[PDB]
Enzyme design. Structure first.
Site, PDB file in Angstrom:
ATOM      1  N   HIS A  41      19.217  11.328  35.344  1.00  0.00           N
ATOM      2  CA  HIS A  41      18.827  10.054  34.726  1.00  0.00           C
ATOM      3  C   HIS A  41      19.994   9.317  34.073  1.00  0.00           C
ATOM      4  CE1 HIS A  41      18.869  11.069  30.384  1.00  0.00           C
ATOM      5  NE2 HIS A  41      18.414  12.261  30.721  1.00  0.00           N
ATOM      6  N   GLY A 138      21.239  11.262  22.736  1.00  0.00           N
ATOM      7  CA  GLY A 138      22.553  11.584  23.233  1.00  0.00           C
ATOM      8  C   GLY A 138      22.798  13.055  23.438  1.00  0.00           C
ATOM      9  N   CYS A 140      21.129  14.835  25.636  1.00  0.00           N
ATOM     10  CA  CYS A 140      20.861  15.205  27.025  1.00  0.00           C
ATOM     11  C   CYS A 140      22.146  15.700  27.683  1.00  0.00           C
ATOM     12  CB  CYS A 140      20.263  14.029  27.821  1.00  0.00           C
ATOM     13  SG  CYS A 140      20.840  12.423  27.403  1.00  0.00           S
TER      14      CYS A 140
HETATM   15  C1  LIG Z   1      19.330  11.640  26.727  1.00  0.00           C
HETATM   16  C2  LIG Z   1      18.741  12.285  25.487  1.00  0.00           C
HETATM   17  O1  LIG Z   1      19.432  12.407  24.490  1.00  0.00           O
HETATM   18  N1  LIG Z   1      17.483  12.735  25.522  1.00  0.00           N
HETATM   19  C3  LIG Z   1      16.993  13.744  24.580  1.00  0.00           C
HETATM   20  C4  LIG Z   1      16.267  13.066  23.427  1.00  0.00           C
HETATM   21  C5  LIG Z   1      15.961  14.133  22.384  1.00  0.00           C
HETATM   22  N2  LIG Z   1      15.726  13.741  21.138  1.00  0.00           N
HETATM   23  O2  LIG Z   1      15.938  15.302  22.696  1.00  0.00           O
HETATM   24  N3  LIG Z   1      16.650  12.305  26.469  1.00  0.00           N
HETATM   25  C6  LIG Z   1      16.025  11.129  26.372  1.00  0.00           C
HETATM   26  O3  LIG Z   1      16.205  10.357  25.442  1.00  0.00           O
HETATM   27  C7  LIG Z   1      15.055  10.768  27.459  1.00  0.00           C
HETATM   28  C8  LIG Z   1      15.666   9.727  28.408  1.00  0.00           C
HETATM   29  C9  LIG Z   1      14.780   9.431  29.621  1.00  0.00           C
HETATM   30  C10 LIG Z   1      15.502   8.523  30.620  1.00  0.00           C
HETATM   31  C11 LIG Z   1      14.599   8.223  31.825  1.00  0.00           C
HETATM   32  C12 LIG Z   1      14.200   9.519  32.525  1.00  0.00           C
HETATM   33  C13 LIG Z   1      13.513  10.446  31.536  1.00  0.00           C
HETATM   34  C14 LIG Z   1      14.423  10.726  30.340  1.00  0.00           C
HETATM   35  N4  LIG Z   1      13.844  10.232  26.860  1.00  0.00           N
HETATM   36  C15 LIG Z   1      13.068  11.022  26.127  1.00  0.00           C
HETATM   37  O4  LIG Z   1      13.359  12.193  25.902  1.00  0.00           O
HETATM   38  C16 LIG Z   1      11.806  10.412  25.577  1.00  0.00           C
HETATM   39  N5  LIG Z   1      10.654  11.171  26.005  1.00  0.00           N
HETATM   40  C17 LIG Z   1       9.771  10.699  26.875  1.00  0.00           C
HETATM   41  O5  LIG Z   1       9.827   9.571  27.341  1.00  0.00           O
HETATM   42  O6  LIG Z   1       8.695  11.584  27.293  1.00  0.00           O
HETATM   43  C18 LIG Z   1       7.747  11.116  28.255  1.00  0.00           C
HETATM   44  C19 LIG Z   1       6.737  10.241  27.543  1.00  0.00           C
HETATM   45  C20 LIG Z   1       6.769   8.849  27.687  1.00  0.00           C
HETATM   46  C21 LIG Z   1       5.834   8.065  27.017  1.00  0.00           C
HETATM   47  C22 LIG Z   1       4.872   8.664  26.202  1.00  0.00           C
HETATM   48  C23 LIG Z   1       4.848  10.048  26.062  1.00  0.00           C
HETATM   49  C24 LIG Z   1       5.782  10.842  26.728  1.00  0.00           C
HETATM   50  C25 LIG Z   1      11.845  10.392  24.051  1.00  0.00           C
HETATM   51  C26 LIG Z   1      13.227   9.965  23.560  1.00  0.00           C
HETATM   52  O7  LIG Z   1      10.853   9.469  23.599  1.00  0.00           O
HETATM   53  C27 LIG Z   1       9.977   9.897  22.539  1.00  0.00           C
HETATM   54  C28 LIG Z   1       9.173   8.683  22.091  1.00  0.00           C
HETATM   55  C29 LIG Z   1       9.029  10.983  23.043  1.00  0.00           C
HETATM   56  C30 LIG Z   1      10.750  10.430  21.334  1.00  0.00           C
END
Ligand SMILES: *CC(=O)N(CCC(N)=O)NC(=O)[C@H](CC1CCCCC1)NC(=O)[C@@H](NC(=O)OCc1ccccc1)[C@@H](C)OC(C)(C)C
Ligand SMILES: *CC(=O)N(CCC(N)=O)NC(=O)[C@H](CC1CCCCC1)NC(=O)[C@@H](NC(=O)OCc1ccccc1)[C@@H](C)OC(C)(C)C
Lengths: 301, 301
Positions: A41, A138, A140
């Site tokens: 991603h 950040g 990830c």
């Molecule tokens: C890159 C990074 O640092 N990281 C870890 C974040 C952490 N605190 O551990 N990853 C991400 O931020 C993810 C980036 C996306 C990019 C597109 C492909 C998928 C990954 N995002 C998340 O980890 C979000 N989680 C998420 O979207 O879960 C699915 C979902 C969507 C909508 C409703 C429920 C579940 C996080 C950052 O978002 C929340 C709101 C869960 C904190």
């Protein structure tokens, strides 16, 4: 004596972390030999990654290793990880393997931001295939690992956080642990359970370190134990679990099934304001191997 | 999100651990530049160390760094540490300082046997100047440290275990923390207390991560708070403690004294079968700095 949540020394992994940037996304990657592994991603802009990746060139990937630019000379996708071939082999590459762990197994996490390690802590893969990590934006690309003598077995790469504050990710070949997918669509952890064999290992740790107050004169059958465990949302204990607890059983003189009898009574009666190994909860993130390593002196190099 | 007992990345220290052998005693030493620091009780045979050390020559000290013999070319005693001058500077010497920490301050311990790192965990210097470590025979010479950007501040070297299973040691200049002496004569830890400012920091960690159930509408004076804290064997909270909790107060919108009111009610009522940050005890081994570092993203390199 003493008993601590103890991570592996992290230097072998620190020498592999790098920053991968492309478009406006920056995350962590893992540089082993001339390949940099990172979450797919990172790719620009319900995404279809095969379609998004065919539109990229090598020079859209910026890989920072210290103050040093690495040049990308090839790329490919394997499941949910990108593999970026760079023109330089990492001189600090340890001996290593990639391993897909089972639920219940523990590992150390080196949390990283912008390719720079921030901390190390110990984790377990929960029965529902999340991990209760500590991760911010950040992180990830941060990896989880075990070390055997001189060999780093990488088992986890971090991808996402779920709504409940727990974490999901992949093995180093890009396959998610659990049913999770790397899209921003609603997903949630399944119901978790307590890792019974690990709780029993920790009770043996308590005995090795001099804590006995929770033992009892009772015993139990495997079947009768499992009946009480289900009721308290514990994983069923199986005979291979019993066999793995063998060495700890023989060092302490407490039959596995007798230790099951004290866990049973601890579950039924609570802990009555007492502690075990400085905990007022039954701890389940130490494997039988963890206990032996910390209570006998096994080193790595 | 998430909150973990998180150690600093240990690679900078791993590159400094060595084996020091002389007579039939082998322990760990710390190789910075051309000096190897180790506990003075490595000395052969109520010992009088000045007398025992004048009887040694350089060649009675065997220093192993990997598969490489280091040659001792000079030695001296500073308090309870030996300093062995070797003919080779450690090429992996990080930027570093030696610092003597206050009670309440935390650090990471790299446990070592035979000069080989075994694990890393996070600790605090207890108010009674012991640390609740995890240490076995041969761990003497293992060090504790903090890291600031690129600089390793060494603050602890391990010497001994006390009858209660807790640990005693020195700063890197050889001065014991607490009243302990490096003789095999009966000694014991004084009565310990809970580190109040740290408990409050951890409650702020809980709020930052979404846990609020323990807050209340009440408030308290500093003086009235300290009256309840003494009764529960908590350290008195002072105004500088209040000032240090300032930034966490302002990020959460919870006045320090209001957070003292919830700690008060948590002490008086117990936790009623609930948990905070996965703990059923009030945790006191996170400083206000620890909380900010883990809940904001501060890295090191
Ligand atoms: C890159 C990074 O640092 N990281 C870890 C974040 C952490 N605190 O551990 N990853 C991400 O931020 C993810 C980036 C996306 C990019 C597109 C492909 C998928 C990954 N995002 C998340 O980890 C979000 N989680 C998420 O979207 O879960 C699915 C979902 C969507 C909508 C409703 C429920 C579940 C996080 C950052 O978002 C929340 C709101 C869960 C904190
Ligand atoms: C070198 C080492 O590994 N290590 C740490 C041990 C550990 N588990 O952390 N240190 C030692 O083993 C100490 C070596 C002596 C050598 C002579 C100078 C002093 C240090 N010994 C101890 O740590 C012992 N503690 C001790 O003797 O405390 C004083 C005392 C004596 C008699 C009664 C009460 C208190 C430990 C190993 O001994 C006990 C029995 C406390 C475990």
């Amino acid at each position: 004596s003493g008993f601590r949540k103890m991570a592996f020394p992290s230097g072998k992994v620190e020498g592999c972390m790098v920053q991968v940037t492309c478009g406006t996304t920056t995350l962590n990657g893992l540089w082993l030999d001339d390949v940099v592994y990172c979450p797919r991603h990172v790719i620009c802009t319900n995404p279809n990654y095969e379609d998004l990746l065919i539109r990229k060139s090598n020079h859209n990937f910026l890989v920072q290793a210290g103050n040093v630019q690495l040049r990308v000379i090839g790329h490919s996708m394997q499941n949910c990880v990108l593999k970026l071939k760079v023109d330089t082999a990492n001189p600090k590459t340890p001996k290593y393997k990639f391993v897909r762990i089972q639920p219940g197994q523990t590992f150390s996490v080196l949390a990283c931001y912008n390719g720079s390690p921030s901390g190390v802590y110990q984790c377990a893969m929960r029965p529902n295939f999340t991990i209760k990590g500590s991760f911010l934006n950040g992180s990830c690309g941060s990896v989880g690992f075990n070390i055997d003598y001189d060999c780093v077995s990488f088992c986890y790469m971090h991808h996402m956080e779920l709504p409940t504050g727990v974490h999901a990710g992949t093995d180093l070949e890009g396959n998610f642990y659990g049913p999770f997918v790397d899209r921003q669509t609603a997903q949630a952890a399944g119901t978790d359970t307590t890792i019974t064999v690990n709780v029993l290992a920790w009770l043996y740790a308590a005995v090795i370190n001099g804590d006995r107050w929770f033992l009892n004169r009772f015993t139990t059958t495997l079947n009768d134990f499992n009946l009480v465990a289900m009721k308290y949302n514990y994983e069923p204990l199986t005979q291979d679990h019993v066999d793995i607890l063998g060495p700890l059983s023989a060092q302490t003189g407490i039959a596995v099934l007798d230790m099951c009898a004290s866990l049973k009574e601890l579950l039924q009666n609570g802990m009555n304001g007492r502690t075990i190994l400085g905990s007022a909860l039954l701890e389940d993130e130490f494997t039988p191997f963890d206990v032996v390593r910390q209570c006998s002196g096994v080193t790595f190099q």
